[PDB]
Design an enzyme around this catalytic site. Structure first.
Site, short mmCIF file in Angstrom:
data_model
loop_
_atom_site.label_atom_id
_atom_site.label_comp_id
_atom_site.label_asym_id
_atom_site.label_seq_id
_atom_site.Cartn_x
_atom_site.Cartn_y
_atom_site.Cartn_z
N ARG A 252 27.43 9.97 3.14
CA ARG A 252 27.95 9.02 2.89
C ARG A 252 28.42 8.37 1.65
NH1 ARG A 252 25.33 4.74 7.80
NH2 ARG A 252 27.27 3.46 7.00
N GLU B 150 25.04 -6.44 17.25
CA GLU B 150 26.44 -6.31 16.65
C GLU B 150 26.87 -5.45 17.22
OE1 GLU B 150 30.11 -8.27 14.72
OE2 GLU B 150 27.53 -9.18 15.60
N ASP C 41 39.61 -27.05 29.59
CA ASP C 41 39.85 -27.13 28.27
C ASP C 41 37.91 -26.25 28.51
OD1 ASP C 41 39.79 -27.04 25.23
OD2 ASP C 41 41.65 -27.16 25.69
N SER D 37 37.94 -3.43 32.24
CA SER D 37 37.88 -3.59 33.20
C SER D 37 39.19 -4.85 34.02
CB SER D 37 36.62 -4.51 33.70
OG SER D 37 35.56 -3.24 33.32
N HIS E 215 16.43 2.28 15.13
CA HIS E 215 17.23 4.26 15.24
C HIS E 215 18.12 4.22 14.30
CE1 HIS E 215 19.65 1.74 17.93
NE2 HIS E 215 21.08 2.20 16.88
N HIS E 216 18.46 3.08 13.12
CA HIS E 216 18.85 3.44 11.71
C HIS E 216 18.20 3.80 10.94
CE1 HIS E 216 22.55 1.38 14.25
NE2 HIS E 216 21.69 1.26 14.93
N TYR F 46 27.14 -3.94 20.10
CA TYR F 46 27.18 -4.43 21.05
C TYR F 46 27.60 -5.38 21.31
CZ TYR F 46 24.44 -0.27 21.98
OH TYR F 46 23.25 1.40 21.90
N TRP G 133 27.44 -2.77 3.24
CA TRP G 133 27.87 -3.34 4.57
C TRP G 133 26.48 -3.94 5.05
CZ3 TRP G 133 27.56 -5.28 10.01
CH2 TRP G 133 26.64 -3.75 10.56
N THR H 218 25.90 2.70 30.84
CA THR H 218 26.47 2.66 30.66
C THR H 218 27.60 3.49 30.99
OG1 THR H 218 25.72 2.31 27.84
CG2 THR H 218 27.90 3.03 28.15
N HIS I 282 22.18 -3.77 15.38
CA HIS I 282 22.50 -2.93 16.88
C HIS I 282 23.12 -4.01 17.24
CE1 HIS I 282 22.75 -0.05 19.64
NE2 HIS I 282 22.71 -1.06 20.76
N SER J 208 30.13 -20.29 12.50
CA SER J 208 30.99 -20.12 13.25
C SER J 208 30.92 -19.07 14.32
CB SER J 208 32.49 -19.27 12.27
OG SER J 208 33.78 -18.73 13.68
N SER J 209 30.44 -18.08 14.67
CA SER J 209 30.27 -17.56 15.91
C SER J 209 28.99 -18.01 16.56
CB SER J 209 29.92 -15.92 15.90
OG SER J 209 30.54 -14.94 14.73
N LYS K 181 29.53 2.32 33.75
CA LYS K 181 30.58 1.41 33.76
C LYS K 181 31.51 1.78 33.72
CE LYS K 181 31.36 -2.17 32.29
NZ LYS K 181 31.10 -3.60 33.10
N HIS L 296 35.54 -2.85 2.61
CA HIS L 296 36.31 -2.70 4.44
C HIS L 296 36.07 -3.03 5.25
CE1 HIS L 296 38.34 0.07 7.46
NE2 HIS L 296 37.04 1.37 6.57
#
Ligand SMILES: CCCCCCCCCCCCCCCCCC(=O)OCC(COC(=O)CCCCCCCCCCCCCCCCC)OC(=O)CCCCCCCCCCCCCCCCC
Ligand code: HEA
Ligand code: HEA
Ligand SMILES: CCCCC/C=C\C/C=C\C/C=C\C/C=C\CCCC(=O)O[C@H](COC(=O)CCCCCCCCCCCCCCCCC)COP(=O)(O)OCCN
Ligand SMILES: CCCCC/C=C\C/C=C\C/C=C\C/C=C\CCCC(=O)O[C@H](COC(=O)CCCCCCCCCCCCCCCCC)COP(=O)(O)OCCN
Ligand SMILES: CCCCC/C=C\C/C=C\C/C=C\C/C=C\CCCC(=O)O[C@H](COC(=O)CCCCCCCCCCCCCCCCC)COP(=O)(O)OCCN
Ligand SMILES: CCCCC/C=C/C/C=C\CCCCCCCC(=O)O[C@H](COC(=O)CCCCCCCCCCCCCCC)COP(=O)(O)OCC[N+](C)(C)C
Ligand SMILES: CCCCCC/C=C\CCCCCCCCCC(=O)O[C@H](COC(=O)CCCCCCCCCCCCCCC)COP(=O)(O)OC[C@@H](O)CO
Ligand SMILES: CCCCCC/C=C\CCCCCCCCCC(=O)O[C@H](COC(=O)CCCCCCCCCCCCCCC)COP(=O)(O)OC[C@@H](O)CO
Ligand SMILES: CCCCCCCCCCO[C@@H]1O[C@H](CO)[C@@H](O[C@H]2O[C@H](CO)[C@@H](O)[C@H](O)[C@H]2O)[C@H](O)[C@H]1O
Ligand SMILES: CCCCCCCCCCO[C@@H]1O[C@H](CO)[C@@H](O[C@H]2O[C@H](CO)[C@@H](O)[C@H](O)[C@H]2O)[C@H](O)[C@H]1O
Ligand SMILES: C[C@H](CCC(=O)O)[C@H]1CC[C@H]2[C@@H]3[C@H](O)C[C@@H]4C[C@H](O)CC[C@]4(C)[C@H]3C[C@H](O)[C@]12C
Ligand SMILES: C[C@H](CCC(=O)O)[C@H]1CC[C@H]2[C@@H]3[C@H](O)C[C@@H]4C[C@H](O)CC[C@]4(C)[C@H]3C[C@H](O)[C@]12C
Ligand code: CUA
Ligand SMILES: [O-][O-]
Ligand SMILES: [Cu+2]
Ligand SMILES: [Mg+2]
Ligand code: NA
Ligand SMILES: [Zn+2]
EC number: 7.1.1.9
Lengths: 84, 98, 79, 259, 46, 43, 227, 58, 514
Positions: I438, I242, I91, I255, I290-291, I244, I126, I316, I240, I156-157, I319, I61
């Site tokens: 979890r 990721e 392009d 925006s 922090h994980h 963001y 994951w 943040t 982390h 890819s990324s 924003k 998932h």
């Protein structure tokens, strides 16, 4: 530092060739001398079956699956003492 | 170490690369690499906008250091003005491709 | 001989939540002390404290395993 | 006919043949590691070799013969190459992290020491020092090639470029030797793991850079490069220097301090 | 030169809305469907 | 955003077909698999 | 343990978990303040016909909605960091107990004096003695002296687990080769329930933890009997 | 070795409306087709293999 | 003339569309996978079998949604579509490398799906922590297929990020500085930079796990003096950035939406918004641990990591409050897009605040591996990242297709979705606080009400998702071509019609210097 040589105001490929032949390659020659001049095999290390070495969690995907890729019986034992 | 035998761009540059080089020499920017220098932008002395076609998007930066460009199609014919600051623009088609 | 021992006290040498080092050290300290005192005609009861502290802190499967490895001659620690 | 200076690329199948070749290589490894065949992996390697030959041929065709690489296009390629090198640096950083993690906090199963008990390390003052002197020298020589090229000297560019290539090949053979004569294996604890994955991955980047220099040598033979336009060579010299430096940190980390 | 303008700049045809309805039904349908068949396939081994 | 008028309007009729087809294509394939979960463990 | 339709934390059994209750109240207070302001102000903007679409001055109010959030964070950080050190604080304990996770059970070990050790599994759903809770009951409980500073050491012997007793403010991952510590101290005797708080495969949901806290007297006697 | 780039320019800038990847000659066309064939061959084979790999074996 | 367009593309727009199409499909997979999860917890007892086949579902998932849904839609789709149109580029810099960037993803997905069909498959989470992901506790191609999936998706990324950065730097008009690019372009660039630095470390981490499984390395195996924690550090160091990477382009689109639908010409405090993003970009790299508040690191370290996480609130907050300052004094056109956008702002703020809760290492002891975390991250992804995609979609769908949606239907959709996702996740807060872990497939008795309500929520979400597929059909069925677009002076992307030509900007924009 500034090394110890001299130049920086007669610059171009000439200088860089001068360095290639007057420093770089002679350094490679000296090191090649030194090295092919501590050679001659070092007496192989008495086997001990330490449990944190010769780790087998899964057969290698080649050979008998107990032999690593650049295996040398001269110096690399298997998990059960040296080969022949 | 200065023998010879390596071609220069003058000699061996071709395609679009060449035309850009040959243009740059004369002092011409057919392929829009330099930013265009502005004018007073009045009715009398408008900003000349080279196009090939009959229209071309102008972007106006009405005050130096504005973070928002003002965008609009400049059409052939009479000098149109920017919606934000009313500086004048005139399309001047052709040349470019001789 | 300085006993009335409940459990291993706080050792500043191992102040944080990873106490792995604590077990490992105290276990060594003992078997070094035990080794040394037999081989110079002396008493093993001096080493007895380290025994308690490792016995307290170490898991049993760990001490099991290390004691098996020492007897087998494959214990990686200097003794 | 456009009136900007960027390159509008002709549709190409190589993205697809490379992406598909990626599938085969990945599948093929998975097959080889588990169900014991190499067939897929072979076919993948081949489809990949073919995709690269053809993609990069076309790049040469687009630039040297078609003249699409304008100043604009070419400045864009520099950003690309630099950014690539940055991700590569970060890739290697994971492996140094690994080494430093292990070596500063040696676990009880190693005897609480670095190197681990039972590990007999290579001597840095022998062949690793040779290898160091070899690659650094290859940095001097490649630099000579670049100045020769800018100065328009064909003989000397090709001479120094050859030297460079040779020194890289020399490093590869020296390293392949040390590998064989080494008294530990990838299996021998975390020493072996950190040693061989990290040096192995570097070794691979040496072959790639040599291959890349070799291409520049032949492109130079066939007169492609001019005294001001020769990004292919620059990109290579960067990559080569990158490799030079990754070796320097291996030497100071794994070979010197870690013994 | 490729075809431009509304409905022409996509890899699927929106010429006839019912042909399209089925296209889309199989496309999104498969996607949503696939996990279930996996969970099924997983269950029929033991 | 002014739109032009629908070139091929989709009548409340048609819409109703569209919506139904769309919901079945999700809900059958799943429901079928879902229905037979006792039959998959205890075959 | 959790009671049905529970909104917040299990009631606090240790004086550390009490502490964590009031810090959460303090934090949530600030969370409601902020999330209410943002909603209100959102509603304030959407409910007027008045307009002002011309340019607004950025440099002026930026200072306020940077400086106040900084203040507020210090109000959260100060106690969070106090309680953090308080958790990890010097404690000279009266007992050391180890627990080892396995796939899929906990084993416990009391070895200050003897070599008292035992496994401890879940009571499967279909073997409970009416009154006994589903998925939360162990055959052998972890018996400990109430009102006493207990050292827990947590390792594992296979994969990762984590040893959690929510009612006590405890959670400490079980890592193979790694001997993690945490102080345990109950204010009250009783049964207190926890569950494996890291993924271990197949029977991850079904390897619980049950503490039984009793006076020193009845604990010493429980030791002898288990020997 | 002599400078035959001047030529290769002319060949590759020729108006024949073939894209860059076939513009060299007939060699390309085979090389292209060999490449693609194998990719499709391989992809089918790796699917075949995925098929095999899912269901266990006596 | 089909294979030359859709298999061999060298065109930012069509590549955009393929990305959008791939993500659409992928969503359905993940959506289906999400219901399989709530189905299983929708009543007490077992449905499927055990935690193994369940955590396959949970694992798959997460990967499907993160790597194959959100990232391709946002960075690949809207990224490739809008970026060049917004800065006047003909392009992308590397259009052919661009097309491979896409074509690596189907192969990657295939591999991930193969992970779940062979053996018992990838039932690790994951995170893919060892020793569970090891060859002992997870033998067979199961995991090794997952690893190769992420390798392919990782490449890819990266190839994309190199493109986006190169493009956005190099291919602006001569006269346009970077402080004159729209706020979305800014969000993609930064996002790209975070990709480029983060992914390589992941690649190493999973390449090291691979060698552990197959070449008898012992990086994570205490047997050989390895450490399971070292993985966590390497995984999370990417992990982390990721999260963001998943929200920054959202920020960008929001925006743009809020400015357009309050009829301002620019969003409020541009440089501040730009600054905020960079700050969030930077501080996202120094927080990974922090994980890991329950693995037993030094207090002084946990102290550091608590404080460093909290600070993100500040840029943040800038924003959040800036978007509000944009609505202020607006002529607010209540479009479907604008509803999605306003939704984002409140629900995002909420997810973020539960983030601040968890940032407290003290408290996190009690809430780690509890459903509270599952709430926090489903607020910011499922009602944050996703609302921003939906809002982006309906706003710009006219520009892509040339056909307009039905706003009534689109408003119906918002309403259903809004209730569904809220009803699904809100109760999980309590589930977390009360002590429900979890990666559980059954639960003690007391957790029954909240899990039940939750799962009833996930169904309303299905109805919404189904409904949307209809809404898109309907658009294409009816064929309402675009007459006139509002506010094109300050929104260049719309200035070539709908859809714009295969080749936009053949002749580039004219921008004066002064
Ligand atoms: C769906 C399930 C409903 C369950 C209801 C609770 C039952 C009461 C038994 C009545 C029983 C009362 C007697 C026992 C006292 C409880 C002591 C306790 O254990 O203490 C801890 C409890 C106590 O928490 C509470 O202080 C009540 C929780 C509800 C928060 C208010 C929002 C409710 C909105 C409408 C319903 C939710 C659906 C919409 C969700 C909307 C998304 C935010 O649990 C929590 O800490 C939950 C923390 C969740 C964090 C959410 C972030 C804030 C977002 C909402 C801001 C809205 C403000 C503007 C004003 C409101 C604007 C909307
Ligand atoms: C898009 C995805 C996304 C985003 C944007 C975020 C944003 C944040 N996240 Fe979250 N997070 C996840 C996705 C995300 N997260 C995921 C997927 C996990 C689980 C990983 C796993 O599978 O294990 C996770 C887990 C996670 C944990 C781990 C808990 C545990 O497992 O034990 C923590 C701990 O600190 C955390 C913190 C934060 C913080 C501080 C922010 C900040 O960015 C918050 C920013 C916003 C605000 C703070 C509100 C807006 C600000 C204002 C209105 C100004 C004023 C505010 C104040 C004064 C406070 N996150
Ligand atoms: C983007 C990321 C993302 C998204 C959108 C979701 C969406 C949902 N998630 Fe998921 N989830 C994760 C990422 C995500 N999740 C991660 C990382 C974990 C942790 C994994 C782990 O523990 O290892 C997790 C874990 C997780 C659990 C924990 C299971 C357990 O540990 O016991 C549960 C339980 O309810 C859950 C439920 C749901 C539900 C009901 C939705 C519903 O909201 C889904 C409804 C569907 C949508 C909102 C998408 C609809 C939109 C589209 C498809 C786009 C359409 C396309 C175009 C317009 C072009 N999730
Ligand atoms: C444990 C360690 C403890 C110590 C740590 C402490 C410090 C770390 C070290 C360094 C950091 C300190 C300061 C750095 C800051 C600023 C440096 C500024 C230099 C600069 O940027 O100046 C520019 C470069 O100048 C130029 O050419 C450059 C001109 C060079 C002049 C010198 C060259 C002549 C000297 C001999 C050269 C040696 C040759 C080497 C080759 C031999 C190899 C064996 C100015 O250009 P310019 O003059 O117009 O060029 C005209 C040239 N035609
Ligand atoms: C001398 C310099 C040249 C080296 C290259 C030459 C040949 C090998 C070919 C390719 C290797 C490519 C990358 C490196 C990968 C792994 C590290 C291997 C290092 C190595 O080659 O070292 C050997 C181990 O090889 C072994 O077992 C393993 C045998 C090799 C196959 C391993 C399987 C490949 C794994 C693929 C993973 C790649 C993932 C990367 C992702 C891409 C980026 C996103 C050493 O042999 P040993 O007996 O242990 O000790 C010596 C005893 N005297
Ligand atoms: C123990 C751990 C071990 C691990 C360590 C391992 C290795 C050590 C690390 C590195 C060493 C490796 C290799 C070095 C060798 C060669 C590199 C190439 C050198 C080169 O040739 O690059 C030149 C200089 O690069 C430039 O400016 C740079 C151009 C950058 C462009 C991309 C920018 C995008 C990223 C953001 C940049 C930030 C900008 C500054 C402000 C940011 C605020 C934070 C090229 O100039 P150019 O771009 O044409 O100028 C045009 C710009 N106007
Ligand atoms: C941590 C918790 C969060 C803290 C939040 C606190 C926020 C503080 C909010 C408001 C402060 C009050 C404003 C004071 C500044 C001065 C206001 C002002 O002066 O308002 C306007 C100025 O316009 C201009 O630049 C632009 C408009 C004025 C500037 C204000 C616009 C932004 C306001 C924010 C919107 C609400 C969002 C709040 C965020 C929580 C008035 O325009 P006039 O037509 O009169 O002038 C035009 C020229 N004259 C003189 C010739 C007619
Ligand atoms: C078993 C192990 C085997 C591994 C397989 C890989 C092996 C070898 C790869 C070797 C690399 C060869 C690359 C050759 C590139 C040729 C094309 C070229 O060099 O292209 C140049 C442009 O730059 C460009 O695209 C330059 C393009 C950038 C190329 C850099 C590629 C790096 C590749 C790294 C891939 C592996 C990554 C490691 C993964 C672990 C052409 O322009 P110029 O040079 O200016 O010429 C123009 C003048 O003539 C006119 O006046
Ligand atoms: C374990 C097994 C896993 C296997 C995974 C393998 C994945 C994929 C395999 C296929 C990759 C090889 C195929 C060749 C790719 C080279 C692309 C390239 O070199 O393309 C260049 C772009 O990159 C530039 O500049 C500079 C950037 C060059 C990038 C080089 C790409 C190499 C591919 C690997 C990337 C490794 C990343 C590792 C870091 C973690 C040129 O740009 P184009 O738009 O193409 O043309 C533009 C024209 O104007 C040129 O005239
Ligand atoms: C990230 C980049 C990854 C780069 C690519 C990975 C490269 C892996 C290369 C593996 O190469 C193979 O290694 C085998 C060594 O085992 C060789 O011989 C083997 O081949 C026979 C065929 O099965 C066996 O039966 C023999 O015993 C055995 O020696 C074989 O020639 C060789 O091709
Ligand atoms: C999470 C998403 C799923 C939510 C639930 C979806 C709602 C159900 C819609 C379609 O479901 C149908 O349910 C029937 C059960 O009533 C099944 O017939 C089953 O039972 C019938 C008899 O009742 C027989 O005609 C059939 O043989 C037998 O397959 C049928 O196949 C299935 O399509
Ligand atoms: C100076 C710079 C840009 C100005 C420009 O060249 O246009 C602006 C953009 C955003 C500004 C920052 C943000 O507004 C957030 C902070 C707000 C406070 O008023 C001062 C510090 C503060 C950190 C600001 C300092 C400075 O004025 C910044 C950094
Ligand atoms: C987490 C990482 C080590 C990971 C590993 O074991 O591989 C370590 C390496 C250096 C450490 C940091 C440095 O020691 C500097 C700081 C020291 C302070 O005592 C805590 C915060 C502090 C900022 C540290 C946090 C953390 O423990 C770091 C970042
Ligand atoms: Cu043990 Cu989960
Ligand atoms: O990471 O939240
Ligand atoms: Cu995080
Ligand atoms: Mg955990
Ligand atoms: Na269940
Ligand atoms: Zn103007």
């Amino acid at each position: 530092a500034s090394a110890a040589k001299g130049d920086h105001g007669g610059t171009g490929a000439r200088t860089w060739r001068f360095l290639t032949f007057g420093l770089a390659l002679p350094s490679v020659a000296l090191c090649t001398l030194n090295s092919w001049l501590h050679s001659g095999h070092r007496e192989r290390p008495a086997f001990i079956p330490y449990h944190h070495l010769r780790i087998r969690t899964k057969p290698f995907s080649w050979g008998d699956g107990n032999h690593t890729f650049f295996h040398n019986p001269r110096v690399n034992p298997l998990p059960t003492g040296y080969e022949k | 170490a200065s023998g010879g035998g390596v071609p220069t761009d003058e000699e061996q540059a071709t395609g679009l690369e060449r035309e850009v080089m040959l243009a740059a020499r004369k002092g011409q920017d057919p392929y829009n690499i330099l930013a265009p220098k502005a004018t007073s932008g009045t009715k009398e002395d408008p900003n000349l906008v080279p196009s090939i076609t009959n229209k071309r998007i102008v972007g106006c930066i009405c005050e130096e250091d504005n973070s928002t460009v003002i965008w609009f199609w400049l059409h052939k014919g009479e000098a149109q003005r920017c919606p934000s600051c009313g500086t004048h623009y005139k399309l001047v088609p052709h040349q470019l491709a001789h | 001989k300085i006993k009335n021992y409940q459990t291993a006290p706080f050792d500043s040498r191992f102040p944080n939540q990873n106490q792995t080092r604590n077990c490992w050290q105290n276990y060594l300290d003992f078997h070094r002390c035990e080794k040394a005192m037999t081989a110079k005609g002396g008493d093993v009861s001096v080493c007895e404290w380290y025994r308690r502290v490792y016995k307290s802190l170490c898991p049993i499967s760990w001490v099991s395993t290390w004691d098996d490895r020492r007897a087998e001659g494959t214990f990686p620690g200097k003794i | 006919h456009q009136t900007h200076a960027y390159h509008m690329v002709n549709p190409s199948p190589w993205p697809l043949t490379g992406a598909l070749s990626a599938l085969l290589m990945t599948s093929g490894l998975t097959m080889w590691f588990h169900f014991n065949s190499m067939t897929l992996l072979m076919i993948g390697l081949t489809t990949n070799m073919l995709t690269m030959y053809q993609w990069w041929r076309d790049v040469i065709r687009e630039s040297t013969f078609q003249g699409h690489h304008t100043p604009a296009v070419q400045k864009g390629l520099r950003y690309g190459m630099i950014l690539f090198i940055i991700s590569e640096v970060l890739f290697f950083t994971g492996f140094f992290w690994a080494f430093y993690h292990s070596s500063l906090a040696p676990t009880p199963e190693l005897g609480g020491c670095w190197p681990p008990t039972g590990i007999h390390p290579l001597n840095p003052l022998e062949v690793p020092l040779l290898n160091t002197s070899v690659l650094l020298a290859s940095g001097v020589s490649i630099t000579w090639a670049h100045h020769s090229l800018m100065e328009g000297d064909r003989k000397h560019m090709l001479q120094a470029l050859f030297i460079t290539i040779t020194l890289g090949v020399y490093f590869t053979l020296l390293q392949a030797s040390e590998y064989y004569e080494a008294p530990f294996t990838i299996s021998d604890g975390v020493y072996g793991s950190t040693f061989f994955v990290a040096t192995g991955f570097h070794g691979l980047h040496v072959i790639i850079g040599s291959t890349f220099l070799i291409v520049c040598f032949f492109r130079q033979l066939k007169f492609h490069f001019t005294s001001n336009h020769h990004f292919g060579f620059e990109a290579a010299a960067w990559y080569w220097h990158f490799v030079d430096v990754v070796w320097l940190f291996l030497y100071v980390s794994i070979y010197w301090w870690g013994s | 030169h490729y075809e431009e303008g509304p409905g022409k700049n996509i890899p699927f045809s929106v010429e006839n809305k019912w042909r399209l309805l089925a296209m889309m039904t199989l496309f999104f349908g498969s996607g949503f469907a696939a996990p279930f068949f996996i969970v099924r396939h997983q269950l029929l081994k033991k | 955003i002014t739109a032009k008028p629908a070139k091929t309007p989709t009548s409340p009729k048609e819409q109703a077909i569209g919506l139904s087809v769309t919901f079945l294509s999700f809900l059958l394939p799943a429901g079928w698999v879902l229905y037979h979960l006792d039959n998959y463990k205890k075959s | 343990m959790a009671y049905p339709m529970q909104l917040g934390f299990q009631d606090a059994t240790s004086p550390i978990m009490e502490e964590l209750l009031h810090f959460h109240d303090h934090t949530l207070m600030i969370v409601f303040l902020i999330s209410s302001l943002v909603l209100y102000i959102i509603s304030l903007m959407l409910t007027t016909k008045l307009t002002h679409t011309s340019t607004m001055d950025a440099q002026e109010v930026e200072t306020i909605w940077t400086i106040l959030p900084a203040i507020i964070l210090i109000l959260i950080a100060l106690p969070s960091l106090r309680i953090l050190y308080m958790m990890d604080e010097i404690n000279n304990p009266s007992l050391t107990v180890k627990t080892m996770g396995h796939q899929w059970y906990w084993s416990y070990e009391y070895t200050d004096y003897e070599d008292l050790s035992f496994d401890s599994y879940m009571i499967p759903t279909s073997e409970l003695k009416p009154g006994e809770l589903r998925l939360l009951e162990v055959d052998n409980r972890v018996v400990l002296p109430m009102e006493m500073t207990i050292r827990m050491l947590v390792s594992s012997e296979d994969v990762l687990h984590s040893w959690a007793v929510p009612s006590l403010g405890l959670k400490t991952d079980a890592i193979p080769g790694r001997l993690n510590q945490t102080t345990l101290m109950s204010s009250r005797p009783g049964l207190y329930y926890g569950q494996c708080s890291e993924i271990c495969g197949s029977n991850h949901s079904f390897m619980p933890i049950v503490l039984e806290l009793v006076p020193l007297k009845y604990f010493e006697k429980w030791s002898a009997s288990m020997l | 070795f002599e400078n035959r780039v001047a030529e290769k320019q002319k060949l590759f800038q020729e108006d024949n409306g073939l894209p860059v990847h076939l513009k060299g000659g007939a060699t390309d066309n085979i090389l292209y087709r060999v490449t693609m064939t194998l990719c499709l061959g391989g992809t089918l084979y790796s699917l075949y293999c995925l098929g095999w790999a899912s269901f266990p074996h006596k | 003339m089909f294979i030359n367009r859709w298999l061999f593309s060298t065109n930012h727009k069509d590549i955009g569309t393929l990305y959008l199409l791939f993500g659409a499909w992928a969503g359905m997979v993940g959506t289906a996978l999400s219901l399989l999860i709530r189905a299983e917890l929708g009543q007490p007892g077992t449905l499927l079998g055990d935690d193994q086949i369940y955590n396959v579902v949970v694992t798959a998932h997460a990967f499907v949604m993160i790597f194959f849904m959100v990232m391709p839609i946002m960075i690949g789709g809207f990224g490739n579509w809008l970026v060049p149109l917004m800065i006047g580029a003909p392009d992308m810099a590397f259009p052919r490398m661009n097309n491979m960037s896409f074509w690596l993803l189907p192969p990657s997905f295939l591999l991930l799906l193969a992970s779940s069909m062979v053996e018992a498959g990838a039932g690790t989470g994951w995170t893919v922590y060892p020793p569970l992901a090891g060859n002992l506790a997870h033998a067979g191609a199961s995991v090794d297929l997952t690893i190769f999936s992420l390798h392919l998706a990782g490449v890819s990324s990266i190839l994309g990020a190199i493109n986006f950065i190169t493009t956005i730097i190099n291919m602006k008009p001569p006269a346009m500085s970077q402080y004159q690019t729209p706020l979305f372009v800014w969000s993609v660039m930064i996002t790209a930079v975070l990709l480029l630095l983060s992914l390589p470390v992941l690649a190493a981490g999973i390449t090291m796990l691979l060698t552990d499984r197959n070449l008898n390395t012992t990086f994570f195996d205490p047997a050989g003096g390895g450490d399971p924690i070292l993985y966590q550090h390497l995984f999370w160091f990417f992990g982390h950035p990721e999260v963001y990477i998943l929200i920054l382009p959202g920020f960008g689109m929001i925006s743009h939406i809020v400015t357009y639908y309050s009829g301002k010409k620019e969003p409020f405090g541009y440089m501040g918004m730009v600054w905020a993003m960079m700050s969030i970009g930077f501080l996202g790299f120094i927080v990974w641990a922090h994980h890991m508040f329950t693995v037993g690191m030094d207090v002084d370290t946990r102290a550091y990591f608590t404080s460093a996480t909290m600070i993100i609130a500040i840029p943040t907050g800038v924003k959040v409050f800036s978007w509000l300052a944009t609505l202020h004094g607006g002529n607010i056109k209540w479009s479907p897009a604008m509803m999605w956008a306003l939704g984002f702002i409140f629900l995002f703020t909420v997810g973020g605040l539960t983030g601040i809760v968890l940032a407290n290492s003290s408290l996190d002891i009690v809430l780690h591996d509890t459903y509270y975390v599952v709430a926090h991250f489903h607020y910011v992804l499922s009602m944050g990242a996703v609302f921003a995609i939906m809002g982006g979609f309906v706003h710009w769908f006219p520009l892509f297709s040339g056909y307009t949606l039905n706003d009534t239907w689109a408003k119906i959709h918002f309403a259903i979705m809004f209730v569904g996702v809220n009803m699904t996740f809100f109760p999980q807060h309590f589930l977390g606080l009360s002590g429900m872990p979890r990666r559980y497939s059954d639960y003690p008795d007391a957790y029954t009400m909240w899990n039940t309500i939750s799962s009833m929520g996930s169904f309303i979400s299905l109805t919404a998702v189904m409904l949307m597929v209809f809404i898109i059909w309907e658009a294409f069925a009816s064929k309402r071509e675009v007459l006139t677009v509002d506010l094109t002076t300050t929104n260049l992307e719309w200035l070539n019609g709908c859809p714009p030509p295969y080749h936009t900007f053949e002749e580039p924009t004219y921008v004066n210097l002064k």
